[PDB]
């Protein structure tokens, strides 16, 4: 039905009001039938009438188009930028400004870009209206301030300080595993000192719930956080004692996660105790055991990890060293084309 | 959900009509008026009859007809509401529903005529002229109403009560109505003579025309108007000069001094002649019998200036006027013939036969014109009498045409009217010419009837 109607929709589009354009785009994006012909004209209309358009509609269109058409979402967000800043600043409805900052943060995260004029205002209002925000909201805000290469020292420091490890259901929480790591990575992206106790508290309670690629990211962040923050060292010790990490080592199946785990562990220096050997060995085993050419990020991470392991003279394990050398040989052979 | 206020629209359209007919009449204003009037609509509003004849009068002025919805809603409510129409509104309605070809635009007229007959007695001077001029346009045929209105005109004009502009209106309306009365026109002439010098030339000439066009067999008025025309000849233009020429020809009397001063006037206005009324100034001369060649040469000279745009009937009238004492100026004649060939559009059967006959009798034969006229002759021969059929047949014979498709219909028609074909003595000589060409072989029944 949509396939038959689309040639007509590409001709009726220029006279579509925004409220209906939202539904049109939602339908064409849910079923993966969005194109580069309806989207261009609908975004042209929504950019032309940005002078007076319901900001709800502009935000909805930007978010919906963010996933598959990042440039059009960026243009829409830029068109209604200053009105959005004024809404963030002067409004009195706490819930509306919360939803607005949250979904504009989602848009910025999706398109991996954001104008600074809006970012200053969203930072200021997020700082002002702090208590109402669920830790998910603060995590999303800091996520948006990451992946956008925008640095705001006061917002980071204030939000982290007020992040007093008051995550929901203190001492046992699963959702914060998807949130806490992000904060750490954000604090890892820049270089701010005064978050070691933060990561310690997060990992001491989230070690039994963190699983999969998450850990790797956290681990890598901690490694970089080891450059300026010493107190993260116990947290790394938590990363080397996680039960999910051990259970993944037993059945290493994801090559990207294994590659990032190796990248973290090589700089962690954990190749000296028997448990460290029993962790490192199966990962290198399954890296070569799984057939096919390794993907580019896997190639780079494995190359760096094996370089750090071979250069590390403290790894006197002959079996592990031979495993590392043959992993490098496989990396070279599969990459010779 | 949005109905334009009809009364205010009427008051606007009156100003628009005044602007359109006083400023010159640019089509932009006409289009604007038609745009505003089309969307106008009488509805559950309660418009009064005074402000309904305005939405109809202005509309019909601006081109609206029964096609629009405004007119169809204004012509109606005149069928149903007739008491509301008083004698002041009646002339406007009647002169509005006159050019309209609908069949309610003719029931309205009759319903109004059934009202003006009863009130033809209780009318003052102005309203009688207005009602008569209104009913002149429709071409109605109610004799009782006309008799009553003539009675009222005579009663009102027994004591001088008509200014020297309503006489022109009344005479023109009655003459166009083709109503022959000696009493009424005698009274009008008496009243016109009473208001001496108030009838200026611009108001004198149409009165002469209206009286001449009615067929009043009498030498009285044609004698009286002579001195007035003689004095007023000084300050009149070419159009009125030619029209008065035609009127004096149709009165049927010969005045030496008036015609002499008319010629002396025309020779001073030869430049302006545009050949649409050269036809009248020539046909009047032909009809009356005067044959003064002083101005014929000047008219011939001016006919060269405008030959490319002679009207169709104008060619017939001028050439048949060039029959009697035609000076055979072939210089103009050849171009007139060529234009007649080129102007071979919708013509008049009488026009065709007269054109061909005048072309043939002057013995200046030409080929293309003859071909065109012979080609056109088939579609009109079914509407010709015996005399004109004979004239057409002789004209064809002098053109030496032997096409069976052209001659069969005319021969059938002339056989259909053989008794009338043979019984006209003035054409007998012509008969001895037509069979001079075709011979006994052509149409044997016609030759057999001719021998007897």
């Amino acid at each position: 039905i949509v396939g038959i109607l689309l040639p007509r929709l590409r001709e009726v589009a220029p006279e579509l009001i925004a409220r209906e354009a939202v539904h049109i785009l939602r339908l064409l994006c849910s079923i993966q039938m969005a194109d580069a012909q309806l989207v261009k004209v609908v975004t042209e209309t929504v950019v032309a009438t940005a002078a007076d358009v319901p900001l709800r509609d502009a935000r909805q269109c930007a978010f919906i188009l963010s996933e598959t058409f990042p440039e059009e979402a960026q243009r829409i967000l830029g068109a209604v930028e200053h009105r959005l800043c004024d809404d963030i600043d002067m409004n009195a409805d706490a819930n509306e400004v919360k939803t607005t900052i949250l979904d504009v943060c989602r848009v910025v995260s999706a398109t991996c870009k954001g104008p600074r004029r809006l970012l200053n205002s969203v930072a200021r209002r997020s700082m002002e209206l702090l208590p109402q925000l669920t830790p998910l909201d603060v995590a999303f805000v800091l996520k948006a301030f990451h992946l956008s290469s925008y640095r705001h020292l006061r917002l980071l420091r204030v939000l982290s300080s007020s992040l007093a490890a008051s995550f929901p259901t203190s001492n046992v929480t699963k959702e914060h595993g998807l949130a806490a790591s992000i904060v750490v990575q954000s604090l890892a992206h820049f270089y701010l000192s005064g978050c070691e106790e933060v990561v310690v508290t997060l990992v001491n309670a989230s070690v039994n719930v963190l699983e999969g690629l998450n850990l790797a990211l956290t681990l890598l962040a901690c490694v970089r956080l080891r450059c300026v923050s010493p107190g993260v060292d116990p947290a790394v010790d938590a990363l080397c004692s996680g039960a999910p990490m051990r259970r993944y080592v037993h059945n290493a199946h994801s090559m990207q996660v294994t590659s990032r785990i190796l990248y973290g562990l090589a700089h962690a220096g954990r190749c000296r105790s028997d448990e460290e050997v029993a962790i490192v060995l199966p990962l290198l085993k399954s890296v070569v055991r799984t057939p096919g050419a390794l993907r580019d990020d896997c190639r780079g991470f494995l190359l760096d990890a094996v370089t750090a392991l071979g250069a590390d003279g403290e790894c006197s394990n002959d079996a592990l060293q031979e495993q590392v050398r043959k992993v490098y040989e496989r990396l070279s052979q599969d990459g010779g084309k | 959900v949005s109905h334009l206020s009809a009364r205010n629209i009427a008051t606007e359209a009156l100003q628009m009509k005044k602007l359109h007919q006083e400023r010159g009449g640019n089509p932009m204003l006409a289009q604007q008026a038609r745009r505003v009037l089309f969307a106008t609509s009488i509805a559950g509003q309660n418009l009064d009859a005074r402000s309904v004849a305005l939405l109809l009068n202005t509309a019909v002025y601006f081109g609206m007809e029964s096609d629009a919805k405004l007119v169809r809603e204004c012509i109606d409510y005149c069928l149903k509401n007739d008491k509301l129409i008083t004698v002041d509104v009646l002339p406007i309605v009647v002169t509005a529903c006159a050019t309209l070809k609908s069949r309610d635009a003719r029931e309205v007229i009759e319903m109004q005529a059934q009202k003006a007959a009863r009130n033809a007695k209780f009318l003052d001077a102005k309203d009688v002229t207005n009602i008569i001029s209104a009913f002149s346009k429709t071409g109605i045929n109610h004799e009782k109403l006309f008799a009553f209105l003539s009675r009222r005109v005579q009663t009102l004009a027994r004591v001088g009560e008509f200014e020297a502009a309503h006489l022109v209106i009344l005479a023109n309306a009655f003459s166009r109505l083709r109503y022959r009365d000696k009493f009424l026109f005698g009274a009008i002439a008496r009243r016109a003579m009473s208001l001496r010098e108030r009838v200026t030339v611009n108001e004198l000439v149409p009165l002469i025309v209206a009286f001449s066009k009615i067929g009043l067999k009498d030498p009285k008025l044609s004698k009286r108007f002579a001195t007035k025309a003689m004095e007023y000849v000084d300050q009149m233009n070419a159009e009125q000069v030619a029209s008065m020429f035609m009127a004096f020809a149709y009165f049927g009397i010969r005045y030496d001094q008036l015609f002499g001063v008319l010629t002396n006037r025309a020779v001073e206005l030869i430049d302006e002649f545009n050949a649409q009324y050269i036809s009248t100034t020539l046909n009047a001369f032909q009809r009356i019998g005067i044959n003064n060649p002083e101005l014929f040469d000047n008219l011939a000279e001016r006919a060269l200036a405008v030959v490319q745009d002679h009207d169709a009937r104008d060619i017939s009238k001028t050439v048949t006027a060039l029959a009697h004492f035609g000076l055979k100026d072939e210089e103009l004649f050849k171009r007139l013939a060529s234009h007649a060939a080129s102007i071979a559009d919708q013509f008049d059967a009488m026009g065709l036969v007269n054109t061909a006959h005048a072309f043939a009798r002057t013995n200046f034969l030409q080929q293309d014109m003859a071909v065109a006229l012979s080609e056109r002759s088939v579609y009109v021969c079914r509407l010709l009498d015996a005399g004109e059929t004979r004239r057409l047949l002789w004209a064809l014979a002098k053109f030496q045409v032997r096409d069976p498709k052209i001659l069969t219909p005319v021969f059938n028609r002339c056989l259909a009217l053989h008794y009338d074909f043979f019984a006209d003595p003035t054409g007998s000589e012509e008969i001895e010419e037509i069979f001079d060409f075709y011979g006994p072989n052509f149409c044997p029944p016609l030759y057999q009837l001719y021998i007897s």
């Binding site: - | 006409a30 038609r34 009125q240 030619a242």
Partner: protein
């Protein structure tokens, strides 16, 4: 610019207002072809073209489509001396 422009079309517009529904090429072509204009300025925008077209048409009318309801008494008319086909007469039957 194409053949769908016709004197009938550019008259049914002029009599309707709405003359601005034709783009610049359409009006330039109308002025060049039908109005016998030497050459329309390519720089000219929509409004100047509309004004020129309206002026040309107004001079082109060259007649009166208004039937006067008045009675002018200075009209010397010497010229004077049904099947129901061309339409559907309203209010009949």
């Amino acid at each position: 610019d194409f053949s769908h422009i016709t004197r009938n079309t550019v008259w049914g517009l002029w009599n309707e207002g709405n003359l601005f529904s034709l783009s610049v090429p359409e009006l330039a072509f109308f002025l060049q072809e039908h109005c016998r204009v030497a050459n329309v300025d390519p720089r000219a925008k929509k409004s100047a073209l509309v004004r020129q077209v309206e002026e040309i048409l107004s001079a082109e009318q060259q007649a009166s489509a208004t039937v006067p309801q008045e009675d002018n008494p200075h009209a010397i008319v010497v010229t004077d001396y049904e099947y129901g086909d061309w339409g559907a007469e309203p209010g009949f039957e």
